[PDB]
Design a protein around this ligand. Structure first.
Ligand SMILES: Cc1ncc(COP(=O)(O)O)c(C=O)c1O
Length: 390
């Protein structure tokens, strides 16, 4: 729960020098929420289109949105799409997609009603992964080594070794990019090895793809996904558009499915309808509409890629102006990994008692929202910087 209850703590002011480095939402240099221009544009288009009703969308969701979302992840020229072996199920954000997928694997994968199948999540991972799959009824939820605290980066040989020792068919939850919370992603060459182990041992890739856009480049961010496609994997991918469209509170996501033949997608999609029918009946519209219109229209599309760049660039800027500021000033070590990490979230270094004092970025692990730094919010986050570090 933590992050949506460090949202309540943002108020507990010692010197009215609080800090939310807590919630995962982009914040401008003036520490405000940023509605994208493309969005404020498209919203008007909707509100000025009197042809639109509010009749029930299909269970699986808006057609146009489902196409555009899957196409964004797999690429316009994907062999999957061209061989009509790709489905998509509008969801209530990435959390919606994940749950729906979790529920489906629990009911239809590795045999029937198989809750014994091992589920694998990065060590560490997003606080909500363990819970989502527990809810879907999986009993065995396991770690794969990922964050090497010592080398402050990817433990590739531990990861691979763990995938090597996973029972055949085990499910594997992968961060498509912008690993949360640590901010280290595999290189393509690192992906190529992981895929190899997963291919030999028939492991199931379940991608989590909540921050497509945040190298700043959407095609770049989707390379891992698109490689697994080209290597002939079957997989799910939980897409969220909460960050890359700023539609947090319209709950816009999509569970893309990749199969070996069209008939699989048909079987699979039809069984998803039952799950949706007893979870939320059918999805909300405003979200999906805003996205569907943006991606389907070349004019708006281009402008949107700009707006994601904008956010992506400010995050790098705030990264530089605090690492590089550890070249002149020092106290313990120095260290590259702030500007090494990518995504929205940094893994700093800290212990649990620094975090208690600190200023207040209270994610015990030491994870901060980089977007939550500003010049005014003092690029000097730790103020002098190493008084709570020294
Ligand atoms: C990997 C990952 N997936 C999904 C989400 C949640 O997005 P939403 O609430 O729109 O599903 C987050 C939030 O930080 C995340 O880090």
């Amino acid at each position: 729960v933590l992050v949506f209850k460090l949202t309540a703590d943002f108020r507990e002011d010692p010197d009215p020098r609080k800090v939310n480095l807590g919630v995962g939402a982009y914040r401008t240099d003036d520490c405000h929420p940023w509605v994208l221009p493309v969005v404020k544009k498209v919203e008007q288009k909707i509100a000025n289109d009197n042809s639109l009703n509010h009749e029930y969308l299909p269970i699986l969701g808006l057609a146009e949105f489902r196409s555009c979302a899957s196409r964004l992840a797999l690429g316009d020229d994907s062999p999957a799409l061209k061989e009509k072996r790709v489905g998509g199920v509008q969801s209530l954000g990435g959390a919606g997609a994940l749950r729906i997928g979790a529920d489906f694997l629990a009911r239809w994968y590795n045999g029937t009603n198989n809750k014994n199948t091992p589920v694998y999540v990065s060590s560490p991972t997003w606080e909500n992964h363990n819970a989502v799959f527990s809810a879907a009824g999986f009993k065995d939820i396991r770690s794969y080594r990922y964050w090497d605290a010592e080398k402050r980066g990817l433990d590739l040989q531990g990861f691979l070794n763990d995938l090597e020792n996973a029972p055949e068919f085990s499910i594997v939850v992968l961060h498509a990019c912008a690993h949360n919370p640590t901010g280290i992603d595999p290189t393509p060459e690192q992906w190529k090895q992981i895929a190899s182990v997963m291919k030999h041992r028939f492991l199931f890739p379940f991608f989590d793809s909540a921050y497509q856009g945040f190298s700043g480049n959407l095609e770049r961010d989707a390379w891992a996904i698109r490689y697994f496609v080209s290597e002939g994997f079957e997989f799910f991918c939980a897409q969220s558009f909460s960050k890359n469209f700023g539609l947090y509170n319209e709950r816009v996501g999509n569970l893309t499915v990749v199969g070996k033949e069209p008939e699989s997608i048909l079987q699979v999609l039809s069984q998803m309808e039952k799950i949706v029918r007893i979870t939320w009946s059918n999805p909300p519209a405003q979200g999906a509409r805003i996205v569907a219109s943006t991606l389907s229209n070349p004019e708006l599309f281009e402008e949107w890629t700009g707006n994601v760049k904008t956010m992506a660039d400010r995050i790098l800027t705030m990264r530089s102006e605090l690492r590089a500021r550890l070249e002149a000033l020092k106290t313990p070590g120095t260290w590259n990994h702030i500007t090494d990490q990518i995504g929205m979230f940094s893994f700093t270094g800290l212990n649990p008692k620094q975090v208690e004092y600190l200023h207040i970025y209270l994610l015990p692990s030491g994870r901060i929202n980089v977007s939550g730094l500003t010049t005014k919010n003092l690029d000097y986050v730790a103020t002098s910087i190493h008084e709570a570090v020294t």
